[PDB]
Design a protein around this nucleic acid. Structure first.
Lengths: 46, 271
RNA sequence: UGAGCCUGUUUGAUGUUCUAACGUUGACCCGUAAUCCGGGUUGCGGACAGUGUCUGGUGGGUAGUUUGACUGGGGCGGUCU
RNA sequence: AAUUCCUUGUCGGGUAAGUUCCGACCUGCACGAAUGGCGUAAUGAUGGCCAGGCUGUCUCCACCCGAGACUCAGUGAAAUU
RNA sequence: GCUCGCCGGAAGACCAAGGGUUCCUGUCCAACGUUAAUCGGGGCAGGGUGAGUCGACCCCUAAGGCGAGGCCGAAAGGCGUAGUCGAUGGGAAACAGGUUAAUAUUCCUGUACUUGGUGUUACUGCGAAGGGGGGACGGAGAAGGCUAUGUUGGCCGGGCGACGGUUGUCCCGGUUUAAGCGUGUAGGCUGGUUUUCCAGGCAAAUCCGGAAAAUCAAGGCUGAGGCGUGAUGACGAGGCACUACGGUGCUGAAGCAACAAAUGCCCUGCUUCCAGGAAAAGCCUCUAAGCAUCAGGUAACAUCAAAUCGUACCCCAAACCGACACAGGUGGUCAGGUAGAGAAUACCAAGGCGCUUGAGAGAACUCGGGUGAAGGAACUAGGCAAAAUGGUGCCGUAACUUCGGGAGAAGGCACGCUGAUAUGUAGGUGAGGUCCCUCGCGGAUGGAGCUGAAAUCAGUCGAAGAUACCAGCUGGCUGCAACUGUUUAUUAAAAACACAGCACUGUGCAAACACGAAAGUGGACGUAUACGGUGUGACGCCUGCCCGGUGCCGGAAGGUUAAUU
RNA sequence: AGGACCGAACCGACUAAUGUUGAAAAAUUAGCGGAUGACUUGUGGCUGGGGGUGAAAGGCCAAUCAAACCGGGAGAUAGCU
């Protein structure tokens, strides 16, 4: 049967990437929260 | 002509076609074509704004001349053509100086005919004159509303307008809807009436024909739930209420015109 | 043509004319290598249209809520001083 | 009658025997003309009824061919208390 | 190592997406592998990916995103011009053979090709952010020419058979060769050349467009295949001497014709139909500012450069999505033999596999199958399930009908093998020879060789000749919806939704209407034969009375009535 | 010529049996419908929660829909066990 997850690198990067987050005001708040928590990986950029 | 199809299949029983053995069988003039992309009824916000639109056949746009402001140089008709963007045929005309253009096709016009425009052109079909220079009681088509803007009235298949009177600097016209209107006397119009008067005798015959032209199904409001339409609900077939639109306004009689800037140009509403 | 006031004085009502506020999703020129925008000239309207404050009408399109107790189960019937 | 409670209404045909099916009658509890009335060739993994051929559906069950169930060696759960 | 079984339009071969060392070699069996393990996609160590021509990067745009100035909004922000990004699309160039434990159009051998810079010679009007050409485009159908590929002959090398025969009309194996360069064929499209004039292509133009004369009738573009060279090369069964059993070095026969033939190529072609079938750059041409000794442009030589990133392995699956070494899901390319209409089905070739617990015995009961005396729906809510029909050719076929249908209605008859007509028939393909020719991939005649249906008559075997897999059950009377379609992913596929047709009503263009505090946008680059809302639902005959109640449309004489004064 | 006819690849889901701590949190076996069209499929893009899309079933919006998921008001209130 067909399942929910179907990978694609281009779509992943265009959706949840560093530059996508930086392009708007709320992605920068997401980045600030994650930096405050102290995460090792900040985005999905590999 | 109008031709019936034979009942060789259930989808061909009720089809009537219009056939004209005079249109071009070939490619249109290329220097007068542009691109035309579809929308589906969506606007710049991405929302459906007009319902029941989507799909169809790919089409290209033909640049047609509605102004007719190249005066003093006669032309000759070359061929009649097909245009998928309107309900009337078009014609390709050549000018004595070596230029081509597109225009609407009047009734009774064939290849090899002369046309002209200006304040000193003959009164015969296909010519363009100001209505200051057209006799009262004439039949015209492709009429302007302001001087120098372009034709906006009587542009469909088999349509025309009458000049009924004249006074001062205005003219009075009767429209296909039964309404009387005033326009300035410097506006332009073309003699005759539009062609293809048999466009209303065709029967599509099946739903695929409607799909081919870009029309999607319409869903009745009495077959819905009371959360989608003011008409939905019931244990069976129940209406018990006054008909209304999907947004609450009453259809079947209520009026919707409100424009005080233009009411000075109406002499009697359509009857 | 309705009120004062003696044809003279100022405010009202209906109407015809006008241009200078205001409108132009009419035509031409420039910024410019541009169907946005701004300026210039010129036609068409014109104190109408449209906007702000206040005010009468309509408004299940939308929202917050109500729709009592006794009872040989509850409802219908009956009762509540 | 996709509509008729009394109801398996009364008459005719099909069966040895037919509350279902077909044709009529009119007493329409409570049909009816674009929330349409009466007909209609062809199409339907649509509802009801009748025939020919076919048969283990049945009177009424018998035998055979394979995979488990049983014994030996290896690994090794579960709900519940 | 020998025998046995299974797939073979796949359970074989190569990729894109996704994964990232799972690839080869040595060593180890604690944990992992539904059992043991000397084994592994498991632990530890080393090795392995070689590009001017393959991709990416690069030049150009589509849907769409961002957006200097600008317009709009309490703030945050929204929409858009000039521009700038964005492939699933357009744009230069390579073939065959050999090699490693693991790479190959990249390494080696042989023969090729494309784009830029510099320099020397010879001639010369060059120049764009502009004009024109081309790139450049739909569905269905048909038949002519070819190739990939297969079969049979001929040629070469080998055999004379475990049990009757096998020196022959006998058995086995091979018979392969590319890109590039030259010739321009089957066929497709288009009249050629020269001179004069002009309100058009935002300015100009020798370019495009329009008009008028004279002359010649054959000039030009496109194009599969075949043929020559590449090739005195490479490859090739076998043989000659050594073996750590993986090989080394040399030698090396024949290497032709006929027939059949594609869903692949000519073909972006031809015919026909209506629903009328992308954009920009690379490329070819014309000129403006400007330079005219120069710069630049065209041709022949010598020379330099072509950078950087990917390249292992799996890819219908034990390596991707499903918590698992899970009976599920996943786009593209390749297409042998016999029987067959066939990419269906049966047995095989190249190739790959026997699915990670076994050994016995032959109770009841459960699951999947074969056969059954007499009867033939008596079973059951109901013929649920099972049983049955099933091909080609020809006879022959009702009520009703919108004249197309119903119809494959229903019901019948023939079907294997051998011989003759005819030592291979009708048809298809087609060499040698003889003539003509504007001399060539030519034209006419001729029939050697190869291939090959269907029919009639006469004999013969079995119970059965459409013998296996494959392959419609048929008729009669009634309710509903006219028809093909759509629907509750995961208990409802229908009489429910849609549909072509009919009617009422709104809308004069800055249109009604809808998304938006607004700017703006769709309706539509449309204009009453157009567009929005509402009800009915092919077609035939039809659609009767009521305006008291609630809505909607018109009227303005009277009565009541807000802010303001 | 055809929203024509029989039928594989491809797209679906009408009947029966097995399975129900399943090989599988929707499958397998034998039959079944469409198959040149209102057809099917690869890559990318747009529509955001009182909102979207819907040939209309209260259908779908990441195994969740008569108002999605996550973090806050928050130790909401609970004459109830």
């Amino acid at each position: 049967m067909k399942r929910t997850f179907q990978p694609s690198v281009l779509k992943r990067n265009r959706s949840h990437g560093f530059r996508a987050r930086m392009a708007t005001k709320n992605g920068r708040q997401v980045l600030a929260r994650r930096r405050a928590k102290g995460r090792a990986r900040l985005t999905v950029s590999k | 002509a109008v031709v019936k199809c034979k009942p060789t299949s259930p989808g061909r029983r009720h089809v009537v076609k219009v056939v004209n053995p005079e249109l071009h069988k070939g490619k249109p003039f290329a220097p007068l074509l542009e691109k035309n992309s579809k929308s589906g009824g969506r606007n710049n916000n991405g929302r459906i704004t007009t319902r029941h639109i989507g799909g169809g056949h790919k089409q290209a746009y033909r640049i047609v001349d509605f102004k007719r402001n190249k005066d003093g140089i006669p032309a000759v008709v070359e061929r009649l053509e097909y245009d998928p963007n309107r309900s009337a045929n078009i014609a390709l005309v050549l000018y004595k100086d070596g230029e081509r253009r597109y225009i609407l096709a009047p009734k009774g016009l064939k290849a090899g005919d002369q046309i002209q425009s200006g304040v000193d052109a003959a009164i015969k079909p296909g010519n363009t004159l100001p209505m200051r220079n057209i006799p009262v009681g004439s039949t015209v088509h492709n009429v302007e509303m302001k001087p120098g803007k372009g034709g906006q009235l009587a542009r469909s298949a088999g349509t025309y307008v009458q000049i009924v009177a004249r006074d001062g600097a205005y003219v009075t016209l009767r429209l296909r809807s039964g309404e009387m209107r005033k326009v300035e006397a410097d506006c332009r119009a073309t003699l005759g009436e539009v062609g293809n008067a048999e466009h209303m005798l065709r029967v599509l015959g099946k739903a695929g024909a409607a799909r081919w032209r870009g029309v999607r199904p319409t869903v009745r409001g009495t077959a819905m739930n009371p959360v989608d339409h003011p008409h939905g609900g019931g244990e069976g077939r129940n209406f018990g209420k006054h008909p209304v639109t999907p947004w609450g306004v009453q259809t079947k009689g209520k009026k919707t015109r409100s424009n005080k800037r233009t009411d000075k140009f109406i002499v009697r509403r359509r009857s």
